[PDB]
Ligand binder design. Structure first.
Ligand SMILES: Cc1ccc(-c2ccc(CN3CCN(C)CC3)cc2)cc1Nc1nc(-c2nccc(N)n2)cs1
Ligand SMILES: Cc1ccc(-c2ccc(CN3CCN(C)CC3)cc2)cc1Nc1nc(-c2nccc(N)n2)cs1
Ligand SMILES: O=c1ccn([C@@H]2O[C@H](COP(=O)(O)OP(=O)(O)O)[C@@H](O)[C@H]2O)c(=O)[nH]1
Ligand SMILES: O=c1ccn([C@@H]2O[C@H](COP(=O)(O)OP(=O)(O)O)[C@@H](O)[C@H]2O)c(=O)[nH]1
Ligand code: NA
Ligand code: NA
Lengths: 229, 229
């Protein structure tokens, strides 16, 4: 019938990829769209993405605009493919997105503008493109699940995951991203150009405690949340 | 009824803007979509476009990717607005485009890649974006009018138009762009990712002679061409 679209949102190493790979296995009616950036961080898209990530490590102020435009295009096409491809025989189909086009713009691209990694022209061009790319519709969200973790938890989990290039990420960076998620999804103080988001249902889950082998309470909250949508 | 879409193609200062402003006045069934880049060269789009042009003059190898993506997005939205906005009461509606999404990629973006103003990653990301942006359709061309002028004519006409920043453009640059137009529209030796273009009708018009006050023979050829479409 009609596919429910749920975004999983959270800071770096909150546990989004772990949570989404738990969920995908619990129902034939449940599908997942991993974040393209995450997959490049692990083919023409993956070759482009790998080069852009490596170029970003050296010179974020040169590559942030190129990176953010390609990350968001890659997400839109991957979300559309799943929407048009999967769950067509499902009774209660749910598609779980690892992050959204809204996190791309209002968390990451925003944060890069604020660190002077994009100049005003790059940021205004990006926002104009984003406003338009997201009208040329079927991707609007039924709900958001916020995986809430402390900067410290996320810093610990970056260490656990053990990607070389990420070991350099400092707590202060994580605390800024954390602040942006809290403004957007808890306090709802963040203004956007997408009216409907103001009223989209949000489930906040505390994931500071390890859930890898003990997630039943979280999934019960997800099932309850889904029945309200 | 159904709007005919005709692209006017030609080298820098061939006379496209002059020709299109002649045509627009000859029929209520005839509308025109100027090239956004041309308009920036004369408002949020114009402010962004003016900054990008100025940044390009200094450092083309820094701004070519950003410039080409914004030029082509600006063209797509301006072509779609005219298609959805105008000629709705017309008997034989024709929309004349100053250049196309195909010139953007196969003439300009291509030429910038070939002058090492974009690296391979920028060029592959641009082509991937272009292939996709042009599927998320109603912009496909019924015909192309090629305004054919010598590099020398175009060099003379740059001098006539008298834009400060353009007086630096050298004949060798114009001769490369000229070669690309000849490959694409006369010899049809240029391969693209758009099958239908191989078989699109092309009218070639020699505009080496001044036509500003003597264009009736050209318009007669345009009217004959249109009756075949
Ligand atoms: C790969 C990489 C490389 C480098 C840096 C980086 C390094 C340093 C800084 C500090 N500032 C100091 C001040 N200076 C003037 C400018 C740089 C800032 C960012 C970040 C990354 N990763 C990133 N990933 C995303 C992202 N992830 C998922 C979805 C999405 N949409 N976006 C955005 S950024
Ligand atoms: C505004 C500007 C500023 C500068 C240069 C420029 C300067 C010098 C060079 C020489 N090479 C030497 C080798 N070096 C490694 C790299 C530069 C190349 C280009 C061109 C422009 N104008 C342009 N307009 C378009 C365009 N126009 C309409 C539609 C569309 N889609 N695209 C494309 S480019
Ligand atoms: O409850 C958890 C959640 C995550 N992790 C680990 O923390 C790291 C970050 O998780 P993930 O990659 O899912 O984070 P994302 O960036 O996807 O939010 C990984 O090594 C996980 O295996 C963990 O040990 N327990
Ligand atoms: O038959 C012509 C065509 C053009 N021009 C002049 O040549 C310059 C370039 O024309 P246009 O701006 O139309 O060129 P485009 O870049 O639009 O092809 C302008 O000063 C025109 O007024 C001219 O004198 N006679
Ligand atoms: Na599943
Ligand atoms: Na007209």
């Amino acid at each position: 019938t009609r596919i429910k679209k749920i975004s999983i949102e959270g800071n770096i190493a909150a546990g989004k990829s772990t949570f989404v790979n738990i969920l995908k296995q619990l129902s034939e009616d449940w599908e997942v769209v991993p974040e393209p950036v995450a997959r490049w961080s692990n083919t023409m898209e993956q070759k482009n993405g790998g080069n852009v990530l490596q170029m970003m490590y050296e010179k974020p102020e040169r590559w942030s605009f190129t990176f953010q435009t390609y990350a968001c295009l890659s997400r839109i096409r991957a979300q559309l493919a799943s929407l048009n491809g999967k769950l067509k025989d499902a009774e209660k189909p749910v598609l779980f997105f690892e992050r959204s086009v809204y996190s791309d713009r209002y968390i990451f691209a925003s944060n890069l503008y604020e660190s002077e990694s994009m100049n005003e022209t790059e940021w205004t061009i990006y926002q104009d493109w984003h406003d338009w790319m997201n009208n040329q519709q079927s991707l609007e969200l039924d709900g958001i699940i916020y995986l809430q973790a402390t900067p410290e938890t996320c810093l610990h989990r970056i260490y656990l995951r053990g990607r070389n290039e990420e070991q350099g990420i400092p707590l202060e960076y994580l605390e800024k991203l954390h602040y942006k998620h809290e403004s957007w999804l808890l306090h709802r103080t963040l203004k956007t150009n997408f009216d409907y988001l103001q009223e989209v249902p949000i489930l906040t889950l505390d994931v500071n405690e390890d859930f890898k082998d003990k997630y039943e309470s979280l999934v019960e909250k997800v099932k309850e949340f889904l029945s309200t949508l």
